[PDB]
Design a protein around this ligand. Sequence first.
Ligand SMILES: OC[C@H]1O[C@@H](O[C@H]2[C@H](O)[C@@H](O)[C@H](O)O[C@@H]2CO)[C@H](O)[C@@H](O)[C@@H]1O
Ligand SMILES: OC[C@H]1O[C@@H](O[C@H]2[C@H](O)[C@@H](O)[C@H](O)O[C@@H]2CO)[C@H](O)[C@@H](O)[C@@H]1O
Length: 179
Amino acid sequence: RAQLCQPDAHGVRRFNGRPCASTTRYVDGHKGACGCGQKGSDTPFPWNLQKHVTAPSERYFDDGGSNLWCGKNCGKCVRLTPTGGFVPGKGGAPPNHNPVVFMVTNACPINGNEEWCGISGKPGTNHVNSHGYEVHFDLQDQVGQVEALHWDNPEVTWEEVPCPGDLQANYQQCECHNS
Ligand SMILES: OC[C@H]1O[C@@H](O[C@H]2[C@H](O)[C@@H](O)[C@H](O)O[C@@H]2CO)[C@H](O)[C@@H](O)[C@@H]1O
Ligand SMILES: OC[C@H]1O[C@@H](O[C@H]2[C@H](O)[C@@H](O)[C@H](O)O[C@@H]2CO)[C@H](O)[C@@H](O)[C@@H]1O
């Protein structure tokens, strides 16, 4: 039993009353789906390669929609707290459970990401990925910021939170701000 969030009656994995999410890490160098780089380029701002930023699964990214540019949840922040769980063979238990806040700056589309991001409804609709989570957070790791957490695809509980001031200021230069 490596996954510590138990599926509820509707199949949604939860932990101590809180919804769980799966996580992965990614690198791709793109500006991303929230326009966090200079307009018209595919060049991210350095902070969007360096900071705690995420590409959530598509249906959360766009609050039930399929838009992959300026999704409704661009610029939102989520606090992710490890449970100690992970998907067997696809992660491991992290050294600590310190929570980390990530800002949504990109999208993990269903297309090409079935296992983790193939979720056919937004959180609250009891649709889950292949591992039983209502949402997935793909974590930017360009500069090893996820390695520095020693997170190997940890299971987490997730919540939306106000963004820290530095991340809020960063987001103000993304093209999707006030879209
Ligand atoms: O599709 C989401 C995301 O997956 C990343 O690969 C995972 C892989 O699926 C998993 O089996 C392994 O244990 O962990 C890696 C890294 O988290 C992939 O690197 C991403 O490009 C992709 O967006
Ligand atoms: O990079 C700008 C470009 O981002 C597109 O989103 C991609 C993103 O680049 C990539 O990092 C991620 O893996 O997949 C998403 C969605 O496919 C966005 O859709 C474009 O409109 C935008 O021009």
